[PDB]
Enzyme design. Structure first.
Site, short mmCIF file in Angstrom:
data_model
loop_
_atom_site.label_atom_id
_atom_site.label_comp_id
_atom_site.label_asym_id
_atom_site.label_seq_id
_atom_site.Cartn_x
_atom_site.Cartn_y
_atom_site.Cartn_z
N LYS A 149 0.82 -1.22 0.00
CA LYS A 149 0.00 0.00 0.00
C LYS A 149 0.85 1.27 0.00
N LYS A 154 4.31 3.77 10.83
CA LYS A 154 3.82 3.65 9.46
C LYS A 154 4.45 4.74 8.60
CE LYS A 154 -0.57 2.92 9.01
NZ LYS A 154 -0.56 1.53 8.51
N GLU A 164 0.59 3.63 18.02
CA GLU A 164 0.74 2.69 19.13
C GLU A 164 1.20 1.34 18.61
OE1 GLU A 164 -2.96 1.88 21.02
OE2 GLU A 164 -2.14 0.37 22.38
N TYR A 165 2.06 0.66 19.36
CA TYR A 165 2.51 -0.67 18.96
C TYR A 165 1.63 -1.76 19.55
CZ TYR A 165 5.43 -4.81 18.39
OH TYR A 165 5.90 -6.06 18.07
N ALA A 166 1.13 -2.63 18.67
CA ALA A 166 0.33 -3.78 19.06
C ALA A 166 1.23 -5.00 19.22
CB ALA A 166 -0.76 -4.04 18.05
N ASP A 175 -13.90 0.63 6.33
CA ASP A 175 -12.99 -0.46 5.97
C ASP A 175 -12.58 -1.30 7.18
OD1 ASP A 175 -11.50 -1.94 4.11
OD2 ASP A 175 -9.68 -0.81 4.57
N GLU A 194 -7.37 -7.54 8.57
CA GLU A 194 -6.04 -7.00 8.29
C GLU A 194 -5.74 -5.77 9.14
OE1 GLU A 194 -8.21 -7.68 5.70
OE2 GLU A 194 -7.30 -9.57 5.06
N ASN A 195 -6.77 -5.01 9.48
CA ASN A 195 -6.60 -3.81 10.30
C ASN A 195 -7.11 -4.02 11.72
OD1 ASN A 195 -5.99 -2.31 7.67
ND2 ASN A 195 -8.17 -2.78 7.41
N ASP A 247 -6.15 1.40 11.22
CA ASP A 247 -6.06 2.57 10.34
C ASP A 247 -7.41 3.10 9.90
OD1 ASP A 247 -6.70 0.44 8.65
OD2 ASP A 247 -4.65 0.28 7.88
C1 LIG Z 1 1.06 1.20 4.87
C2 LIG Z 1 1.03 -0.05 5.74
C3 LIG Z 1 -0.09 -0.58 6.39
C4 LIG Z 1 0.34 -1.72 7.08
C5 LIG Z 1 -0.54 -2.63 7.93
N1 LIG Z 1 0.16 -2.97 9.15
C6 LIG Z 1 -0.09 -2.45 10.38
C7 LIG Z 1 0.81 -3.01 11.30
C8 LIG Z 1 0.92 -2.77 12.70
C9 LIG Z 1 0.54 -1.55 13.30
CL1 LIG Z 1 -0.12 -0.21 12.39
C10 LIG Z 1 0.69 -1.39 14.70
N2 LIG Z 1 1.20 -2.38 15.48
C11 LIG Z 1 1.59 -3.59 14.91
N3 LIG Z 1 2.13 -4.76 15.46
C12 LIG Z 1 2.32 -5.66 14.47
C13 LIG Z 1 2.86 -6.95 14.66
C14 LIG Z 1 3.22 -7.48 15.90
N4 LIG Z 1 3.69 -8.73 15.70
C15 LIG Z 1 4.17 -9.61 16.74
N5 LIG Z 1 3.64 -9.01 14.38
C16 LIG Z 1 3.14 -7.94 13.71
C17 LIG Z 1 2.92 -7.87 12.21
N6 LIG Z 1 1.93 -5.10 13.29
C18 LIG Z 1 1.46 -3.81 13.56
C19 LIG Z 1 1.59 -3.89 10.55
N7 LIG Z 1 1.19 -3.84 9.26
N8 LIG Z 1 1.66 -1.87 6.86
O1 LIG Z 1 2.09 -0.84 6.03
#
Ligand SMILES: Cc1cc(Cn2cc(-c3c(Cl)cnc4nc(-c5cn(C)nc5C)[nH]c34)cn2)no1
EC number: 2.7.11.1
Length: 252
Positions: free
Chosen positions: A18, A37, A86-88, A131, A135-136, A149
């Site tokens: 994206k 991001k 924020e970090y997930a 949306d 995925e989100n 997002d």
């Molecule tokens: C442009 C664009 C959109 C994406 C989608 N995307 C979101 C994440 C993501 C975000 Cl926004 C926040 N925290 C995250 N933690 C993870 C994650 C944690 N583990 C253990 N594995 C993952 C994967 N992803 C997060 C990732 N991608 N990407 O670019």
């Protein structure tokens, strides 16, 4: 606050695609773990849709709910734009659905309840996320669901309502639809309308054509039928959703 790239140490890439990529980032003077991001203006000017993004930033910046991924702030250099998120910790619902193949009704009904609470919060602010797809959907340290997002908030078809894909103008019930699509996928592993072509998916969503595999229980089938119907007006409010027998009997 004013940020620069040299305020963050860039780490492991969490997601690609994206016209932008997110990396796990730790800020330097306080060791804060966050997701960065990173979108590029070059690819974004060719997309020419800063419109909803500047809105999405404004949308997500002051949204304060435990089931919504908090956006901390924005900043940019010349060629790219950074969104400080924020970090997930536990990842996406997508990959975890990928690994478990399907969710048992407890994890599903719990996921739905969290979504409803987050949506009832967004609906209280007249916000429509449009949306909503696995995925989100993200997971917190406790493993709680967190909506990500809002770039497409105020294409990929499978979760979009009949009224939305056809041209009639949406309302907030389009999330009730998306909620219904999500509940099905969580239990089955696939979307109700998943097809092999766009033109074909479009028809199934339009004619509202789906069938239940034999393992989906009766209480489950009921909630999905109430959410996934053509006419938006007779769709349940999130109140009626949370107080659904099957939701109550399996949510935690
Ligand atoms: C442009 C664009 C959109 C994406 C989608 N995307 C979101 C994440 C993501 C975000 Cl926004 C926040 N925290 C995250 N933690 C993870 C994650 C944690 N583990 C253990 N594995 C993952 C994967 N992803 C997060 C990732 N991608 N990407 O670019």
């Amino acid at each position: 606050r004013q940020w620069a790239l040299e305020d963050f140490e860039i780490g492991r890439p969490l997601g690609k695609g994206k016209f932008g990529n997110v990396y796990l980032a730790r800020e330097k003077q306080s060791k804060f773990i966050l997701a960065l991001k990173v979108l590029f203006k070059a690819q974004l000017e060719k997309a020419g849709v800063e419109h909803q993004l500047r809105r999405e930033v404004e949308i997500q910046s002051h949204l304060r709910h435990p089931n919504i991924l908090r956006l901390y702030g924005y900043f940019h250099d010349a060629t790219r734009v950074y969104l400080i998120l924020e970090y997930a910790p536990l990842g996406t619902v997508y990959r975890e659905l990928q690994k478990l193949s399907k969710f048992d009704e407890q994890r599903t009904a719990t996921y739905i309840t969290e979504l409803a609470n987050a949506l009832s919060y967004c609906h209280s602010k007249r916000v429509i996320h449009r949306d909503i797809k696995p995925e989100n959907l993200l997971l917190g340290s406790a493993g709680e669901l967190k909506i990500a997002d809002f770039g497409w908030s105020v294409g990929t078809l499978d979760y979009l309502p009949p009224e939305m894909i056809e041209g009639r103008m949406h309302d907030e019930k389009v999330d009730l639809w998306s909620l219904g699509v999500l509940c099905y996928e969580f239990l089955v592993g696939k979307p109700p309308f998943e097809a092999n072509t766009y033109q074909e998916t479009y028809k199934r969503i339009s004619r509202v054509e789906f069938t239940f595999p034999d393992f989906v229980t009766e209480g489950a089938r009921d909630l999905i039928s109430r959410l996934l119907k053509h006419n938006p007006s007779q769709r349940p409010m999130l109140r009626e959703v949370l107080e659904h027998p099957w939701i109550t009997a399996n949510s935690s």
